[PDB]
């Protein structure tokens, strides 16, 4: 039996708590049984989605010469990548603000 | 005071240090990620739970999680998410 | 032949029937081109999910249950085909 | 045989092992080209594992056939 209890997140080479996901699936009332690979698979897609948002949020924060990702940068990242816009169309971010956009007809004309 | 509260805080830092080894997260954005992870987890879990009964099966395996991701994540985010899912599960099965 | 245009099968009078169900007096000539594109987008978005359901079911026929399921996933539920 | 082995990151490594050999020389040709110990690597074809003494012709391997190298991380 013992010892060294190698962690399943490390077995899958992930950073998310694969062990937690079982506890969040078994007690989540989703089915009688949960497969062995289901938590591992969830821990991969969740990690990928978080890392993709953070990759763009860091770039947005760099554009303001800041080092801490404020919620403003999060929504600036989400509402720019249209493939994430589709994912989070019906999602509002607290203190996130709005993308700056002006219709060309509203813009002043000097001609 | 003994009431323990679980969250995804430590993992969001730890994934961040790979993609950006220098930046940081405010508490408000950490709270936003905590809700985002829970939202996506519940969406995908509900889709899989339906898919189990949708084919009269009673176990949640990785196959329908792969299927469920292809129903929610639009476009080629689905391709990359399934990439990561299979990549992670194959390494786990090897060990 | 092989894989004809086949989107002209949504004929010009057919679009006017649909419009006049919604209560439209006049149709400009450019509506027919845009309606086919919108219709094709809708079919793509529905048939994709239906095909994925079938593939998860390890089947080759696309049952009406799968179509009802795909439409429910988008919030546009049908009534009557279920069951 | 001209077969290239895929990795989990996207690295192509060709291996010159004729279709009637076992896997001991395949993995040896892996070490002498990269230097990864046997414990730290395993080979998977078409989703199924590969036995070290099993011959390559039993899996009807053809020319320019892809193979996947999984890095077995112990520690």
């Amino acid at each position: 039996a013992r010892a060294k209890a190698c962690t399943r997140s490390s077995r899958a080479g992930l950073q998310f708590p694969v062990g937690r996901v079982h506890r969040l699936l078994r007690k989540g009332h989703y089915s009688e049984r949960v497969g062995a690979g289901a938590p591992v698979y969830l821990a991969a897609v969740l990690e990928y989605l978080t890392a993709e948002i953070l990759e763009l949020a860091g770039n947005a924060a760099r554009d303001n010469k800041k080092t801490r990702i404020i919620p403003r940068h999060l929504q600036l990242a989400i509402r720019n990548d249209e493939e994430l816009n589709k994912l989070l169309g019906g999602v509002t971010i607290a203190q996130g603000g709005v993308l700056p956009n002006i219709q060309a007809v509203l813009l002043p004309k000097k001609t | 005071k003994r009431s323990r509260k679980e969250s995804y805080s430590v993992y969001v830092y730890k994934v961040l240090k790979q993609v950006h080894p220098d930046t940081g997260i405010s508490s408000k954005a950490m709270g936003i990620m905590n809700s985002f992870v829970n939202d996506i987890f519940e969406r995908i879990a509900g889709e899989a739970s339906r898919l189990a009964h949708y084919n009269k099966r009673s176990t949640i395996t990785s196959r329908e999680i792969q299927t469920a991701v292809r129903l929610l994540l639009p476009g080629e985010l689905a391709k990359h998410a399934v990439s990561e899912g299979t990549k992670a599960v194959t390494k786990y099965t090897s060990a | 032949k092989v894989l004809r245009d086949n989107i002209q099968g949504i004929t010009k009078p057919a679009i006017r029937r649909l419009a006049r169900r919604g209560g439209v007096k006049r149709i400009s000539g450019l509506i027919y081109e845009e309606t086919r594109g919108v219709l094709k987008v809708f079919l793509e978005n529905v048939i994709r999910d239906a095909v994925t359901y079938t593939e998860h079911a390890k089947r080759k026929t696309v049952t009406a249950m799968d179509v009802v399921y795909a439409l429910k996933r988008q919030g546009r539920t049908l009534y009557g085909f279920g069951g | 045989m001209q077969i290239f082995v895929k990795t989990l990151t996207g690295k192509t490594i060709t291996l010159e092992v004729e279709p009637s050999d076992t896997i001991e020389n395949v993995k040896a040709k892996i070490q002498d080209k990269e230097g990864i110990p046997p414990d730290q690597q395993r080979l998977i074809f078409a989703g199924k594992q590969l036995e070290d003494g099993r011959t390559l012709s039993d899996y009807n391997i053809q020319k320019e056939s892809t193979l996947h190298l999984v890095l077995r991380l112990r520690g």
Partner: peptide
Amino acid sequence: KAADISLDNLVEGKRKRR
């Protein structure tokens, strides 16, 4: 490609797309 989970359809490089 939509079958038993996968071993072939893994990935290209990173999906930059701006």
